[PDB]
Amino acid sequence: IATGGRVTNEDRRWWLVHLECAPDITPGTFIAWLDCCGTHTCKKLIERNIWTIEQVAALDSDQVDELKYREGCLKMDVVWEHARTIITPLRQREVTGGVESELQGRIMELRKKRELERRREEILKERANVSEQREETLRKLREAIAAKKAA
Amino acid sequence: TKEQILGAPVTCNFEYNPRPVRLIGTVMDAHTEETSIKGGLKVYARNEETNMMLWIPPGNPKLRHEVTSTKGSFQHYLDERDKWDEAWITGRAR
Amino acid sequence: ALFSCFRCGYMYEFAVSNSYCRKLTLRNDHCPRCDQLTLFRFMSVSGMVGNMPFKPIGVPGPSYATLWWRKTREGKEASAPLDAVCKSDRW
Amino acid sequence: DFGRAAARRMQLERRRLEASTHPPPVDPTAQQACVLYRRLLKAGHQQLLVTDKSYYARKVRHEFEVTARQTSARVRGIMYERGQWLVENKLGGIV
Amino acid sequence: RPHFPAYNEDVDRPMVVPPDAICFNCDKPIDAGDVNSYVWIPAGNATVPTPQGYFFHFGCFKCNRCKYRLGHNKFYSKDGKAWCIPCALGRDVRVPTRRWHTSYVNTHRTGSRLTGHFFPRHSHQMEFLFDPN
Amino acid sequence: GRAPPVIGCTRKARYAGIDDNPTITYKPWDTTEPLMADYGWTRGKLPKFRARSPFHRQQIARRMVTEMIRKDYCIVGGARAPALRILADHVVELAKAGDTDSRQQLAYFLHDPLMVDKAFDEYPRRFKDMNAKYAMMTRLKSRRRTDAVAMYFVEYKNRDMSDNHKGEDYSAGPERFFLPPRIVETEKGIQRPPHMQMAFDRWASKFKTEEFHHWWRLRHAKLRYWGVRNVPHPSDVDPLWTEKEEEEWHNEMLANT
Amino acid sequence: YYWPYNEDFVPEGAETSRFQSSGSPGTRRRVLQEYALSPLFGARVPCCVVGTLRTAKEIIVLKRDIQSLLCELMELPQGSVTLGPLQQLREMMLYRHGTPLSPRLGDERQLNMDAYARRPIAARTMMDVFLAEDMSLDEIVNFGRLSLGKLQIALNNLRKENVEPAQLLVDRMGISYCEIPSLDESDYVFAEVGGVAVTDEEAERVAQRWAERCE
Amino acid sequence: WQSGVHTPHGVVYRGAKMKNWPEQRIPENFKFTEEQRFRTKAIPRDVGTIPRNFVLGVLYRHQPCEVGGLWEHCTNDPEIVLDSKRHLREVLKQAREEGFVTFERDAISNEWLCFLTRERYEEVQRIVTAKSEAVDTHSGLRGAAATETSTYAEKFREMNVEAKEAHARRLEEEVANTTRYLRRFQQREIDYLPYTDLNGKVNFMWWYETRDVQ
Amino acid sequence: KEYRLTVPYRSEVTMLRLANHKAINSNIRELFKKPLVMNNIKAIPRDLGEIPRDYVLRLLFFHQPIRLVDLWTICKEHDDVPLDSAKHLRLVLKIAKLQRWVYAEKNQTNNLYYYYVHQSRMQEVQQMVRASEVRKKEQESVREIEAEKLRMEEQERRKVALDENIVALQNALVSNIAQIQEFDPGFARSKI
RNA sequence: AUAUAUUUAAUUUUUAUAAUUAAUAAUAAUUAAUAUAAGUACGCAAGGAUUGAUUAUUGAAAAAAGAAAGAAGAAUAUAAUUUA
RNA sequence: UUAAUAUUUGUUUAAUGAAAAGUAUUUUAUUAUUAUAUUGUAUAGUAUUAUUAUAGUGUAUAGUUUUUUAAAAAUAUAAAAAUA
Ligand SMILES: [Mg+2]
Ligand SMILES: [Mg+2]
Ligand SMILES: [Zn+2]
Ligand SMILES: [Zn+2]
Ligand SMILES: [Zn+2]
């Protein structure tokens, strides 16, 4: 993300609406997922013992200044703003997963699973029954051939 | 990312007269990671006897394509790649 | 490239760049089995160090001997006795 | 060849073993053929609104009488299975 | 055009100089790797004597009966000694016009390198690579 | 949608800007990584100095970077100077990264593993407090007489923060090319790393033999037979290294400690 | 041709992370509507942006004393003023105007309308000043105007001359600029999300859901 | 190597530690992304003379070994030089490439065992004897202590076969106990420094020291 | 002039093709491409005599007859073969024909090798090979006896190895006791 | 198979600024698919015209008034993305 | 005059004994061993320091160390897509 030099409400809304495109991202995921988090930034954060988006969001402005003007992290402000912007829905995902659960429901989850297994069993039962009918028709052909040979 | 997008089946409905065309084709390549007006998507769709390689641009109101796998399936991507390669080499007249 | 020791036949692999084209035929390298400096000869060919222009990283690729040499020391039947101690994918 | 080609050949061999275990479908007999014909005729006369019932019966008779007698026994069984599919799926969209 | 590979791969059966190594005409020890004064003729066989190829000194690669060089650089083993084809076939001793008591042969299997065992060795070794197992 | 008025990648002029139109264009390799850049006359590429081939150009670049890391500076000519400066920046970037892949890449590129080690030892601590532009390029007012090409002095910036080259004076070269470089009076008591000191001592003692004097006189004879002017006669030549000169140079080296 | 991805691009037997919530476009649109109507987290309104002519490497050592003196200037209890990250404005040779990374000037058109030019650069390193989150925008802008006036009076006194918090900020801390940033209007209301119009009742439902999640 | 990112939380390897490597605490909610886990690259361990000799000494102590209990035996060994199970696996792979040890599979228990090759068994025995003599020369004791140790050795030698086996089991379990106790007082620091050989290849030079921790 | 040579990053095969130096373990094909008066490559030393002769004699008396390609494939199928090429096999068979060991008779469209001149000596050599196989079986029985002896020797090795393990663990034990006595001798005095 | 002369195509490098005139590249006798006028006019009848629209054929053009011995990039597409 | 011309441009060495040929001031060229007078050892040719390894033995890892230049046309080679 460019941000043109400063993080704005449009960038925060961008991150918020892109949070849908990452359902498996928890508040405890690694720091390389945040935008503009290069290898230098990630190594400096690991030196600071920062392995988590929560630990990035819990940083202080003085620590961010130290990381940006004494360590060499250019987009440290952008990484920190991204973390602070996305940290609040991540806590909800971790504690309950509200936006992920209230829209589907365990009832619909189990319904989908049961219908999936029933359809998968029916697909094979169709072939089982058609093979049974084929064997029955083969036996009927054998009986008809025996009758014709007797005739 | 590419490693998690390529290989996913895509259901594409294209509004065409007199009846919209409905296809299912796996992702072969993507041109942009995040959403963008130049996003792009490369899809290989194979019908009963027809094999085609579509490049669907994003944001067209007539070309409604949806990714449904939610996952990558790199092995399925490799299988579809080999199928398309064999079909493309076969289709040339000799 | 893949090199073997002249005295014992110990084999190790290492890609050769454009700055070491003179040392592609014969390498004077320390041998771990002989525990001293031995002469190493060129055995099989690897792909390259750099990239061929407008060609992928796989082109050209190693020969069948290099691919076979790796598969005997690291693979399904090779790492199976070693997947029970550490499972290298993990620590 | 390669590892992927070897795996593909092994998968094809397994599929061919399964297909060889499975038998050729069917050569239908007169009794079940007439049963299917009666089912088709009754289903048409039950749900055949705009299509001429006479023309439908003529088409079914023509099929059962000439198409199977012209084609091979395997295709006869394929036609039998397809007629059963039509009976179960409402003549295949014949409105 | 030459129709033979270069840098023969010995991954299937490595051809290395043994620690103990005697001559065929001399039955005396030779230098192992410090000097290439010996002549190595490898063929990938453990057949006695001197498995995975016998060895000759440069000066002694000559026939043992007539003490002369070889015609086409091909010697004949005779009860543990190396003879020449005119000696083995029973013909008369022919003095060569060129060098007498030494033959044209390279050192350290350089002359016998373009022919022998290459990769792959057997057929079951290629299927080991192309199979996932 | 339609196509641009000029379709396909068409070579433009040297000073023509970008077009910013949809065009299927592929790069030869990933030039974003250090020491893997491409040479060309567009702005996205390094200025390709003259060479018989891209392979020869890469060899010249490798020897340039090797000598640059060796003696902390290099006087080059023409379009070689921007390429040398950018490649020195790339080397410093790899050294500050300090990965095993970075070590292996700098070893693949350089001609001297000892110089690879020297770079990875010195440059991190030397340019820890710098963001970019680790090398300085100065266009000299004197030109190479043979081809009238513009000369450029390329060096590294943090001279004082370095272990080697701490206090070295480049206003004038040493008395001999095998002698240690000049040192300012203020930094006379400086000390060098022992491994680099031993390497330099070995390379310098290489030239203290009589076979080198014979090579020197034979080079005089060769260049005189090849038509090169202002080359004296091997009878009039005199050795670069003698006993009394070596004694006083050893005295000065012990003074500089 | 060549495919851009080799076989070893993804290790066999390893699964990748999922890139969307569900395969259903309706559920996708509902989750997108939730995340679009969500309140803007991590968004703060600074009362004033304070800037100095020095560099961030020189101001980091004094950033805490600046916080204390700004608290004393606001006349608030100690620990109510928070300083944002230091932003070093781009050292520009041409000086395009209006850019967020452009160095500030000691003059504005509203201040000197009849002036044929502007005054030279007054700030090169800036920092936002945030109050407590419970404070309203009215109190925020009041404190901002108060600090602006006090710092302007302190700069005038310094210019006329050569214990007060403003005098300390101007002399010891080297602070030479203060501005009031305009309200950010970048976030526009999503009237429709995914083509489906967002009703007032659905917007209130999403607001209540997010309020309960924050609670 | 950290306890949370490279291994599940709660586990720890009782072995030599790397010098100046902080054992920083990783939160429990930490998880890697499926794509980020692929591109992780570990530093190469030391498969050199000291680690291979240590592993060969363990494999000579336990004749034969099994790949499961090999790490436990290495941890019980007093002078452990291995860093972790990855270092152990790399040293095993290097020994297999050099030909010191071979890997077989028992058809009874369906488990992989590590046997010593007949051609290299003599060199392994020589290495073990040299290491024993070095440990004897380095170990310090008074006259009475040396006399008591010699008497105990003579008694263990004069004991029977099964008596010697039971004595060896008791001795190795007491060695395991005293090593677990002494580890709390001192550890083994492994230090490394990369360099490049004349062939342009990058390899590390390693030092192994002992440092007291209180 | 070659594209592979002008390419900035040369491949290993491209660098091999530049190995025109007459040296040990060099590019033999690239050195053979140049004329014989330029490259010092003498004739190929092909070992002839009884060593390949008896081998091909056994392999041919087994089948009697086989074609040349079949003989070469059957030989290559084995592990130890004194023959390096089908041309070497051809030269050995030609020398054997000259010495009246094998004779080649042409069928309707091919030639096959037979043993008719030395058929009695061929059967004698076959019986000698069979007796050598019987002696190999007797040596395998002697190797089973020597393996019982080696099991006894391995029991002795296990005895000395457990003694070495005891004397080593006792040394490690006393070293750890000394260390613990240096640090906190209470535990050492408790363990005695 | 030759630039020697003529003749042409360019150029003489930010010129804040085309256009009073010289000279100068596109002056329909188009073709093919549709559909509408219309199932009209016109024919004894079967039949059945003329016809301005979309595609099809895929391009766009302005001459002379300013300070000149580097790369019109300080070059890895930023007018210095922190910099000792 | 052509001619501000064409042409040259010295930044990286993979190989080993004669004779014809060549006489270039070898100042004592070598310093010695053996034995035994005398005699002679360095550099081709194609009008040249030139597309050039004179193939008489013999075999070999000594790297057995003179090729400028910052964009263009035409030409010369080499490569040159999922079009045919
Ligand atoms: Mg001008
Ligand atoms: Mg001449
Ligand atoms: Zn070795
Ligand atoms: Zn001999
Ligand atoms: Zn002879």
Can you give the three-state secondary structure of E8-65, one letter per residue? CCCCCCCCCCCCCCECCCCCCECCCCCCCCEEEECCCCCCCCCCCCEEEECCCCCCCC
d(C-alpha H60, C-alpha H49), whole Å? 16
B67 SS3 class: strand
d(C-alpha G98, C-alpha G89), whole Å? 12
- Please, which experimental method was used? cryo-EM
Residues ending a continuous segment of chain D before a break (C–N > 2.5 Å): none
Short-list G162, G89, G77, CA closest to G126: G89
Strands G48-52 and G196-197: unpaired
Question: Exposure string (b/e) for I15-49, b if CB count within 10 Å is 16 or more?
Answer: bbbebeeeebbbbbbbbbeeeeeeeebebbbbbbb
Residues of chain I found within 8 Å of residue C3, distances taken between Cβ atoms = none
Alpha helices in chain H (DSSP H): 34-38, 49-61, 70-76, 85-98, 121-138, 143-158, 161-182
Contact C11, C31 (CB under 8 A): no
From the CA of B61, how many Å to the C1' of J34?
Answer: 27
Cα angle A26-A28-A33, degrees, rounded to a multiple of 5 = 75
Distance set, CA F74 to CA F47, F110, F135, F136, F170 (Å): 18, 15, 11, 11, 11
Instruction: Mutation target for I interface from F29, F46, F53, F105: give the one with most I CBs within 10 A.
Output: F53
**Any idea which residue has 């090593």 for tokens?**
H179
Q: E122 labelled as ligand-binding?
A: no
Other Cβ atoms less than 10 A from the Cβ of A128: the count is 10
Strands E75-78 and I48-49: parallel
Question: Subunits touching H (CB < 8 Å, at least 3 pairs)?
Answer: A, B, C, F, G, I
H1 SS3 class: coil
d(C-alpha G57, C-alpha C82), whole Å? 52
d(C-alpha C69, C-alpha H97), whole Å? 11
Q: C34 labelled as ligand-binding?
A: yes
One-letter amino acid of H113: L
* A51 lies within 8 A of chain H by CB: yes
* G9 lies within 8 A of chain C by CB: no
* G16 lies within 8 A of chain H by CB: yes
Strands G104-105 and G175-179: unpaired
Distance set, CA I20 to CA I15, I39, I47 (Å): 10, 9, 28
What's the token pair of residue A29?
A: 């995921």
C-beta atoms of F29 and C50 within 8 A: yes
Q: How many CA atoms lie within 13 A of I171 on its CB side?
A: 18
C-beta atoms of A141 and D29 within 8 A: yes
What's the token pair of residue B85?
A: 């390669």
Distance I40 CA to ligand 2 centre (A): 29
Strand J close residues, chain A 17-56, CB < 7 angstroms: none
Distance E76 CA to ligand 5 centre (A): 9
Alpha helices in H139-199 (DSSP H): 143-158, 161-182
C-alpha D54: how far from chain center: 23
Distance F219 CA to ligand 2 centre (A): 24
In the beta sheet, which residues pair with residue H111? H106
Short-list I21, I23, I20, I17, CA closest to I4: I17
* D2 lies within 8 A of chain B by CB: no
Complete DSSP assignment for chain A = --GGGS--HHHHHHHHHHGGG-TT--TTB-GGGSTT--HHHHHHHHHTT--SHHHHHT--HHHHHHIIIII--TTHHHHHHHHHHHHHHHHHHHHT-HHHHTTT-HHHHHHHHHHHHHHHHHHHHHHHHHHHHHHHHHHHHHHHHHHHHH-
C38-57 residues touching I, CB cutoff 8 A: 41-42, 45-53
Q: How many E/I residue pairs have CB atoms within 8 Å? A: 115
C-beta atoms of A33 and H31 within 8 A: no
Strands G175-179 and G48-52: antiparallel
Do chains A and E touch by CB distance (3+ pairs < 8 Å)? no
Distance F72 CA to ligand 5 centre (A): 69
CA distance G14 to chain C (A): 11
Q: What CA dihedral angle connects G190, G192, G195 and G196, to 10 degrees?
A: 140
**Burial (0-12, 13-18, 19+ Cβ within 10 Å), F136:** middle
Q: Which of B2, B70, B75 is opposite residue G5, by nearest beta carbon?
A: B2
d(C-alpha E17, C-alpha E36), whole Å? 11
Bases of strand J lying below 7 A from some protein CB:
58-60, 70-77, 79-84
Q: Which of C17, C32, C85 is opposite residue H88, by nearest beta carbon?
A: C85
d(C-alpha F155, C-alpha F69), whole Å? 9
Contact F69, F118 (CB under 8 A): yes
Contact G17, A24 (CB under 8 A): yes
Instruction: For residue F52, give the nucleotide whose C1' atom is nearest its CA.
Output: K67
From the CA of C22, how many Å to the C1' of K81?
Answer: 37
Distance set, CA A16 to CA A84, E63, F152, G202, H189 (Å): 11, 91, 52, 19, 47
H155 secondary structure, DSSP code: H
Strand J close residues, chain F 53-112, CB < 7 angstroms: 81-82, 85-86, 89-90
One-letter amino acid of F106: L
Q: How many B/G residue pairs have CB atoms within 8 Å? A: 38
B26 SS3 class: strand
Strand J close residues, chain F 30-59, CB < 7 angstroms: 31-32, 37, 41-47
**Nearby residues of G7 by Cβ (< 8 Å), 6 or more positions away:** B78, D4
From the CA of I33, how many Å to the C1' of K41?
Answer: 38
Instruction: Mutation target for A interface from D15, D26, D31: give the one with most A CBs within 10 A.
Output: D26
Residues of chain F found within 8 Å of residue A72, distances taken between Cβ atoms = 131
Distance set, CA E108 to CA C20, E36, E81, G136 (Å): 25, 6, 20, 92
d(C-alpha B72, C-alpha G27), whole Å? 20
Strands F39-40 and F46-47: parallel
Strands F150-156 and H202-212: unpaired
**Burial (0-12, 13-18, 19+ Cβ within 10 Å), H39:** exposed
C-beta atoms of G21 and A87 within 8 A: no
Round to the nearest angstrom and report the end-to-end CA distance of chain E: 37
Cα angle F79-F82-F87, degrees, rounded to a multiple of 5 = 125
**Nearby residues of G15 by Cβ (< 8 Å), 6 or more positions away:** B71, B72, H34
Residues of chain I found within 8 Å of residue C41, distances taken between Cβ atoms = 25
Residues of chain H found within 8 Å of residue G11, distances taken between Cβ atoms = 38
Sign of CA dihedral E121, E122, E128, E131: positive
- E strands, I95-149, in order: 103-106, 111-114
Strands G192-193 and B63-67: unpaired
Instruction: Mutation target for G interface from H37, H40, H41: give the one with most G CBs within 10 A.
Output: H37
Other Cβ atoms less than 10 A from the Cβ of A27: the count is 23
d(C-alpha E129, C-alpha B54), whole Å? 36
**Any idea which residue has 């770079």 for tokens?**
F119
Round to the nearest angstrom and report the end-to-end CA distance of chain G: 57
Complete DSSP assignment for chain G = ---SS-GGGS-TT-----SSS-S-HHHHHHHHHHHHHS--TT----SEEEEESS-HHHHGGGHHHHHHHHHHHHTPPTT--EE---EE----SS--SS-TTSPEES--TTT-TT-SS---EEESEEEEEE--TTS-HHHHHHHHHHHHHHHHHHHHHHHHH---HHHHHHHTS-EEEEE-PPPP--S---SEETTEE--HHHHHHHHHHHHHHH-
C-beta atoms of F108 and C19 within 8 A: yes
Q: How many CA atoms lie within 13 A of D87 on its CB side?
A: 16
Question: Within 7 Å: CB of G145 and strand J?
Answer: no
From the CA of F211, how many Å to the C1' of K30?
Answer: 18
Q: Which of G27, G43, G99 is opposite residue A12, by nearest beta carbon?
A: G43
C-beta atoms of H38 and B3 within 8 A: yes
Contact A9, G40 (CB under 8 A): yes
Q: E87 labelled as ligand-binding?
A: yes
Contact H208, H190 (CB under 8 A): yes
d(C-alpha E101, C-alpha E84), whole Å? 13
From the CA of E94, how many Å to the C1' of K18?
Answer: 29
**Nearby residues of I55 by Cβ (< 8 Å), 6 or more positions away:** E47, I75, I81, I82, I83
B24 SS3 class: strand
What's the token pair of residue A124?
A: 């094979």
* G4 lies within 8 A of chain C by CB: yes
What's the token pair of residue G157?
A: 């006194």
Short-list E75, E76, E68, CA closest to E98: E68
Contact I163, H164 (CB under 8 A): yes
Distance E28 CA to ligand 4 centre (A): 7
d(C-alpha H18, C-alpha A111), whole Å? 53
Residues of chain C found within 8 Å of residue I31, distances taken between Cβ atoms = none
d(C-alpha H100, C-alpha B84), whole Å? 49
Closest residue in chain C to residue E5, using alpha carbons only: C44
C-beta atoms of A16 and G35 within 8 A: yes
- What stretch of H or E contains C44? strand C36-44
Closest residue in chain E to residue I54, using alpha carbons only: E47
* D7 lies within 8 A of chain E by CB: yes
What's the token pair of residue E114?
A: 């373009």
